[PDB]
Amino acid sequence: GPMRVFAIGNPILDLVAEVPSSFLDEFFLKRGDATLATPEQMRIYSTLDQFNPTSLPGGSALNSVRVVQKLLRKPGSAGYMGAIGDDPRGQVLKELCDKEGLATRFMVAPGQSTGTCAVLINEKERTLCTHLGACGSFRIPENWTTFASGALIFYATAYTLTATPKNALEVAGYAHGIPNAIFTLNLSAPFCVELYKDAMQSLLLHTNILFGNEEEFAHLAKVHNLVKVALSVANKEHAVTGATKLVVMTRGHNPVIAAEQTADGTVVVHEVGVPVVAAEKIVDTNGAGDAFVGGFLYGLSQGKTVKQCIMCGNACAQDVIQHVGFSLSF
Ligand SMILES: Nc1ncnc2c1ncn2[C@@H]1O[C@H](COP(=O)(O)OP(=O)(O)CP(=O)(O)O)[C@@H](O)[C@H]1O
Ligand SMILES: Nc1ncnc2c1[C@@H](I)NN2[C@@H]1O[C@H](CO)[C@@H](O)[C@H]1O
Ligand SMILES: [Cl-]
Ligand SMILES: [Mg+2]
């Protein structure tokens, strides 16, 4: 069907720059973290100019869906909804999406600025600090189901819970009433797991595929009960005549772990190796996870197997990490 994947997310503009450790220190940032800017960090945005940054579209789910659209090629292969400000920045993101053939319906938040994220690279690690702006006012239009008519794969990032959990909840609920439809969710970041516990709980029950990195599940284990393999098998309970129930945990260069609960109750686990990539060849890890999910969703949509999906995800992520910031090559 026309649209294969539909997602909701926070459309944001990324400002990427390589900075010294001292910068991270002055802005109270922890290397490798992902957070929402505090008032004392708002100054990061203007101060980056001295580092000759580069700017490009960002937004986790948006990066993911762009990979899918890039791979499926046909216009409207992937659809996305989110909110942008009524500023020039928002227009730029929109035009870029249109040029890619992505199907979109952006809600404009009057008088608000489009979200921006500072992608700071130090060593070879990335730290993300975002100012959501307009993204926080996103409200799914009631006719979204029509716009996404035909998609069987629905995706949302936990990052979207900040605007309101209602958005992801409506997407999940709708996918649930559709046969052969699956709802997929990304834990997105530690802060998401920690702050949106109750909402996550209701969402997980309706989630078919849960994605996340080792760091994200650890917090999920703590926040919940259960407290690699065990954490992964643990999480499967939270989600738990066979509707897809799978958990996919990424772990940098370590093997990818995917646990699935089949129709009969049998739990099947897969530990898939990740091809070695020379450290000197690694540029930056910004967007590795997003590309992984994009490759994974693209493959899933092609009916490939769980192992094959992971392989496709690994391939996309490897390419992207050998480039500055995100990259749509392949
Ligand atoms: N050192 C490494 N060598 C090879 N692949 C790596 C890698 N680090 C990450 N990856 C690839 O990227 C996938 C996801 O990595 P990971 O989830 O740890 O990225 P990340 O969370 O930094 C991304 P983001 O910046 O988008 O939040 C891995 O499964 C693997 O395929
Ligand atoms: N809160 C939030 N919401 C959506 N996307 C986000 C963020 C944050 I902290 N970081 N990012 C995006 O994650 C990508 C890296 O995985 C970057 O492109 C960046 O825009
Ligand atoms: Cl997002
Ligand atoms: Mg990483």
From Swiss-Prot:
Involved pathway(s): Purine metabolism; AMP biosynthesis via salvage pathway; AMP from adenosine: step 1/1
One Pfam family linked to the record: PfkB
Any GO molecular function: ATP binding
Cofactor binding, note field: Binds 1 Mg(2+) ion per subunit.
Record-level GO cellular component terms: cytosol; nucleus
Cofactor(s) for this UniProt protein: Mg(2+)
Enzyme class label: transferase
Gene Ontology BP term (one): AMP salvage
Family listed: Belongs to the carbohydrate kinase PfkB family.
Role noted for this protein: ATP-dependent phosphorylation of adenosine and other related nucleoside analogs to monophosphate derivatives. It is a key purine metabolic enzyme in the opportunistic parasitic protozoan toxoplasma gondii as it cannot synthesize purines de novo.
Name the record gives this protein: Adenosine kinase
Classification of source organism: Eukaryota, Sar, Alveolata, Apicomplexa, Conoidasida
